[PDB]
Specification:
The chain has 995 residues and is mostly helical. It contains 44 helices and no strands. The modification Phosphothreonine is found at residues 604, 672.
């Protein structure tokens, strides 16, 4: 199982790689050609030396490093490579004795493998304890949070503030060094961007205690609004500690996150769908007074997030949730047809809409059917991971004839079938040929009695037999979970398109369950983006969605009967790609009209909440308004949070942005209730300066959080989208000033008048965001220069706002005040003028191979520098697809291609670097330097893993399930490579147009 975990594990195995390479080159040539063998000892001594250099350290690491868990498995570890070292000894003996000795010719490949298997192991057997240096530190930080719970005294917190000093500074000096070590970037980012947010809460945790100092008033105990504020954060600190446990525990690419990230996505659904249900419920319950604009925002959204629950399970049941959503949604749509026409009144159609009120309880069952069939599928995945790790527990003490030690392993082996007793309700074909595989382990359970009775030599013998049997068992348990949830919605924008576009070409020969699930997302986001819109746009955009949603069942039947090759099936899927083109291109064009209403004035709840927080004299008309402004603060953030997710679901960015967008939305979802009690405990512990400033912590936490959400949502869409929706708004709102100069009401002026200032500086807020990010000053200069044209006009607007507030029926003055704002628009469009660029066995490898080629055709360049680089690598990946199970005499080209796979990915590494310094934007380089870290990382690993496989090939003396455990590492890190380089070849060229 040759890992590539630590930086140093790479830089030692790659010397072992080029050694064992030329070793097994000599092994093949004496077999396929029968070459007279040259020397061995100058390799043989040199290959064991770099081994033994670790080993006498590992001798000392047994003898003087005193981990009382390392001494159980490290002493079996380093003898095994030393056993493999002794295999190298007789090889150099007998082949120098006889180069033609065919047993000694093939007493060579077996020694070449157990070294390099163990060489990866022994490097990891060191980093067993080295990473375990960090866990009990973090466990103490968890117990510091338990020590945080201990605190009941004002005298405590002073030195417990002094306690975190040696706490986090050791956490600083350990984690930040580990930041440079591990070489999976998006796996690296899970540590440091966890750890800075761990650092961000350190005074916030103290301020949680210092607002708990405000619980050390006369109300020492109490209901304590700030108690959950403490209790959330200490859970949230323990959340990111538990997260960086497993990120440091993890050794290669993750294969369990999608049994987890869905489970929180359940909780952002199931705890949100029951919430907006209650406003969905009474809205349809009121038949006549429901004009399809306010509670309709609940109605469509409950459906569309049930559609996001409709990405959890598969098969027929996945069809059934989109069946019931279109059922009770179109029953509301005809109610929307009956009401808006006029005759949709209370008594005639109160049972017609009751169809939906009984219909929503289907979707209550539809989500929990997706829930329990998810979580039970996940509970079994870890329990089988525990019991194969409990499989060494009896192997830690295999005894002759004891009572309980074989009694417990039967209670172990009873639990190993619980996986197949839960993999059976989800699948039948591969299960009934794996219910015999666990029944084959019942024959190994029958073999437990010869070591259940007293016998030592067979006990280790079937231990190796159950070693290959349990490694077969977990792998076939792993394959069960794989095919039983479809390929999820690739969360970024074109990933939902690219999980669909191939499925338009030929859904007959296809990928499982993804394409039908792909445009499930687009109809869930088309309906979401239609939900907030206007009357002639609501039903306008809902109709273009169901224009595609009717194409689904027709595409579901033109291959159910018939197939997709026929041109009467091609023409049926012809205009669907036309319809889906306008589906997105109207959505993201109307996405920016959905941000500029609620984001442009994003600070405005808080300061109005602040004056609601700062000055109560305990007069009336204050505290319920404070609740109302909190209710504003809920739904303003409730839009702000949800609107960002829509802009996350459609925003052109990378993974690191859109995850950090929704992570900011998570902190927008986290900290918005945090402000609620914190501003409340200001008004529960009234007027106290010791209580006051914790708001100014947490609001300056929140505003910065919202600003770092703002600036990223600003970074999410292009600004040309963000400008024009704002630019048409100020054209709209100045016309609203014109009719407010007609309809005489001066207080409605000064709200909309200062609303212009909320947008004007906001243009300058993201003008500065351009300024810091741009490499080119000549396309930065007017972004600063013409910004002052706003700055010398934003406040003079407010000046004669006050003048017409003195005399609203004064013409000329109001003509000047209208002409004060009129010269704003002469430059806001000039900001657009600035942002105008005018100023033959195992073939999933072949499935990975063809993907880069269509991505390679997805660019037009003068010189195919990265394009041909992607081309011949995908060709060699196509050679990798054919050679993965080829003839035994072909293992030389196995590595020789993988040498080029190391080489060409190091060219894709290099060519990504050469234009990163050429590019004229800093965000595109930063996201490139995010994505280009893995390009040289796994490049040499596949060169390493081919040498592992070249040993494995032609063996016929090993369990072949271990060979496919080695083969799957090739095909996954094929797909780790190919999906990575597909991201780079487009996006570097998506960077290349900026020159």
């Amino acid at each position: 199982m040759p890992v590539f975990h630590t930086r140093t594990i790479e830089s030692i195995l790659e010397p072992v790689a080029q050694q064992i390479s030329h070793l097994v080159i000599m092994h093949e040539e004496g077999e396929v050609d029968g070459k007279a063998i040259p020397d061995l000892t100058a390799p043989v001594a040199a290959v064991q030396a770099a081994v033994s250099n670790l080993v006498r350290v590992g001798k000392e690491t047994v003898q003087t490093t005193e981990d009382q868990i390392l001494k159980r498995d490290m002493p079996p570890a380093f003898i095994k490579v030393e056993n493999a070292c002794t295999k190298l000894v007789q090889a150099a003996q007998m082949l120098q004795s006889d180069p033609y000795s065919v047993p000694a010719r093939d007493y060579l490949i077996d020694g070449s493998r157990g070294i390099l298997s163990g060489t990866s192991d022994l490097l990891l057997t060191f980093d067993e304890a080295e990473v375990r240096k960090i866990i009990r530190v973090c466990k103490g930080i968890l117990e510091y949070l338990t020590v945080a719970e201990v605190v009941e005294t004002m005298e405590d917190l002073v030195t417990y503030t002094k306690n975190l000093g040696p706490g986090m500074t050791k956490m600083a000096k350990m984690i930040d060094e580990r930041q440079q070590e591990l070489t999976h970037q998006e796996h690296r980012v899970m540590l440091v961007n966890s750890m800075n947010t761990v650092k961000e809460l350190l005074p916030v945790l103290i301020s949680a205690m210092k607002i708990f100092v405000t619980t050390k008033n006369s109300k020492n105990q109490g209901i304590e609004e700030a108690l959950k504020n403490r209790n959330f954060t200490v859970e949230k600190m323990s959340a990111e500690i538990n997260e960086i446990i497993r990120v440091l525990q993890l050794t290669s690419w993750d294969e369990d996150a999608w049994a987890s990230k869905d489970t929180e996505a359940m909780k952002r659904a199931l705890a949100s769908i029951d919430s907006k249900l209650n406003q969905a419920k009474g809205w349809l319950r009121d038949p006549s007074a429901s004009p399809g604009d306010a509670g309709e925002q609940a109605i469509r959204q409950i459906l569309d997030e049930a559609g996001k629950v409709g990405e959890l399970c598969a098969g027929k049941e996945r069809r059934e949730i989109l069946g019931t959503c279109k059922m009770l949604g179109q029953m509301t749509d005809q109610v929307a047809d009956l009401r808006a026409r006029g005759q949709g009144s209370s008594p005639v159609a109160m049972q017609k809409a009751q169809q939906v009120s009984q219909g929503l309880d289907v979707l209550t069952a539809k989500v929990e059917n997706a829930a329990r069939k998810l979580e039970a599928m996940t509970n079994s995945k870890q329990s089988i991971a525990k019991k194969i790790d409990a499989a060494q527990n009896w192997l830690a003490d295999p005894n002759g004839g004891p009572e309980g030690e074989e009694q417990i392993r039967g209670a172990l082996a009873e639990a190993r079938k619980i996986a197949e007793l839960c993999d059976d309700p989800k699948e039948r074909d591969d299960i009934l040929r794996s219910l015999g595989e666990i029944s084959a382990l019942t024959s190994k359970l029958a073999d437990l009695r010869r070591q259940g009775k007293g016998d030592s030599p067979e006990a280790r013998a079937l231990a190796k037999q159950v070693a290959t049997a349990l490694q077969n068992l977990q792998t076939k348990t792993n394959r069960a979970v794989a095919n039983s949830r479809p390929a999820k919605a690739a969360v970024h924008l074109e990933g939902k398109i690219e999980q669909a576009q191939r499925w338009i070409d030929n859904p007959t020969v296809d990928d499982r369950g993804v394409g039908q699930a792909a445009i499930r997302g687009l109809v869930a986001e088309g309906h979401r983006l239609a939900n907030v819109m206007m009357g002639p746009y609501r039903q306008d955009l809902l109709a273009k969605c169901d224009r595609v949603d009717q194409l689904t069942a027709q595409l579901a039947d033109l291959a159910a009967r018939g197939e997709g090759e026929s041109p009467q099936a091609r023409a049926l899927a012809s205009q669907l790609q036309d319809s889906l083109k306008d589906l997105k291109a109207r959505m993201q064009e109307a996405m920016t009209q959905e941000v500029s209403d609620v984001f442009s004035d994003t600070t405005t709840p808080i300061k109005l909440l602040a004056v609601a927080a700062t000055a109560p004299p305990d007069a009336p008309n204050r505290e319920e308004v404070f609740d109302e402004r909190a209710a504003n603060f809920e739904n303003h953030s409730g839009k702000l949070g949800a609107t960002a997710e829509k802009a996350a679901a459609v925003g052109t960015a990378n993974k690191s942005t859109v995850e950090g967008i929704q992570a900011s939305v998570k902190t927008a979802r986290e900290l918005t209730p945090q402000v609620v009690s914190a501003a409340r405990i200001l008004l529960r512990n009234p007027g106290n300066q010791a209580a006051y400033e914790h708001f100014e912590t947490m609001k300056n936490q929140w505003i910065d959080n919202v600003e770092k959400m703002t600036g990223l949502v600003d970074e999410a869409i292009d600004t040309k989208s963000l400008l024009d929706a704002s630019e048409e708004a100020i054209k709209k709102d100045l016309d609203k000033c014109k009719v407010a100069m007609a309809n005489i009401q001066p207080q409605m002026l000064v709200a909309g008048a200062t609303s212009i200032a909320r947008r004007a500086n906001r243009i300058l807020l993201v003008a500065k965001r351009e300024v810091e990010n741009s490499e080119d000053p000549k396309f930065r200069e007017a972004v600063k220069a013409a910004s002052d044209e706003l700055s010398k006009t934003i406040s003079p607007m407010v000046m004669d706002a006050k003048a017409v507030a003195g005399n609203i029926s004064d013409p000329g003055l109001q003509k000047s005040f209208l002409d004060s704002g009129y010269r704003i628009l002469g430059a806001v469009a000039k900001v657009r003028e600035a942002f105008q660029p005018q100023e033959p066995v195992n073939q999933p490898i072949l499935a990975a191979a063809q993907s880069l080629h269509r991505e390679a055709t997805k660019w037009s360049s003068k010189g195919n520098d990265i394009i041909a680089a992607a081309k011949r690598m995908a060709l060699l990946m196509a050679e990798m697809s054919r050679l993965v199970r080829g003839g035994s005499g072909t293992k030389r080209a196995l590595i020789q291609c993988a040498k080029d796979i190391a080489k060409a990915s190091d060219e894709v590494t290099r060519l990504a670097k050469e234009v990163a310094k050429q590019c004229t934007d800093k965000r595109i380089r930063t996201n490139l330097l995010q994505v280009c870290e893995r390009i040289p990382t796994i490049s040499t690993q596949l060169k390493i893993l081919s040498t592992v496989k070249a040993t494995m090939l032609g063996r016929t003396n090993i369990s072949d399930e271990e060979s496919e455990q080695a083969t799957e590492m090739l095909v996954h890190n094929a797909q780790n490579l190919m999906q990575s380089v597909k991201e780079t070849v487009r996006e570097a060229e998506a960077a290349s147009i900026k020159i």
